[PDB]
Write an enzyme that holds these catalytic residues in place. Sequence first.
Site, PDB file in Angstrom:
ATOM      1  CD  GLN A 279      -2.669  -1.292   2.530  1.00 30.56           C
ATOM      2  OE1 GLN A 279      -3.047  -0.245   3.058  1.00 30.56           O
ATOM      3  NE2 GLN A 279      -3.015  -2.492   2.986  1.00 30.56           N
TER       4      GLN A 279
ATOM      5  CE1 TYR B 213      14.621   2.430   2.602  1.00 35.50           C
ATOM      6  CE2 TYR B 213      15.613   0.257   2.403  1.00 35.50           C
ATOM      7  CZ  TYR B 213      14.787   1.142   3.065  1.00 35.50           C
ATOM      8  OH  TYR B 213      14.130   0.714   4.199  1.00 35.50           O
TER       9      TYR B 213
END
Length: 155
Positions: free
Chosen positions: A92, A126
């Site tokens: 999500q 990242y």
Amino acid sequence: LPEELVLLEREQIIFSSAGDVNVYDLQALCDKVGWPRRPLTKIAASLRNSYLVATLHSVTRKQLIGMARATSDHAFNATIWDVLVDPSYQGQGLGKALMEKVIRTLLQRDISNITLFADNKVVDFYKNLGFEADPQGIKGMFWYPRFLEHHHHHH
């Protein structure tokens, strides 16, 4: 960027950098991602000595669903050690949302050098947020590291 703020209301998801994490709630969250338990007083110690403790709670009355934890020298450097989102809420975008607020909070505190240690399977995650591995060939090194079955990044 304030200390507390609603990320979304689907139930509310609340971000905070206040650092109020109950060690039993954190233990239960780490259970969900398979961490071996550790002494609660040493977890408590690690928390009070973490410059940034950032949380996500579901507020329908609060349930801890995510946390990011960083140490810092309060001036120049920070290391983000743990980034954890409840498996029930993964997919999500909550890990990404938590990380944006973490980075913004550290920059507002004038921390210039923000680091982390990414397991192989979250390096690209990242990178997309602006992290860069091995700048100028700098290497992250560990003193006689043990084999890690468990990972410190869950999104």
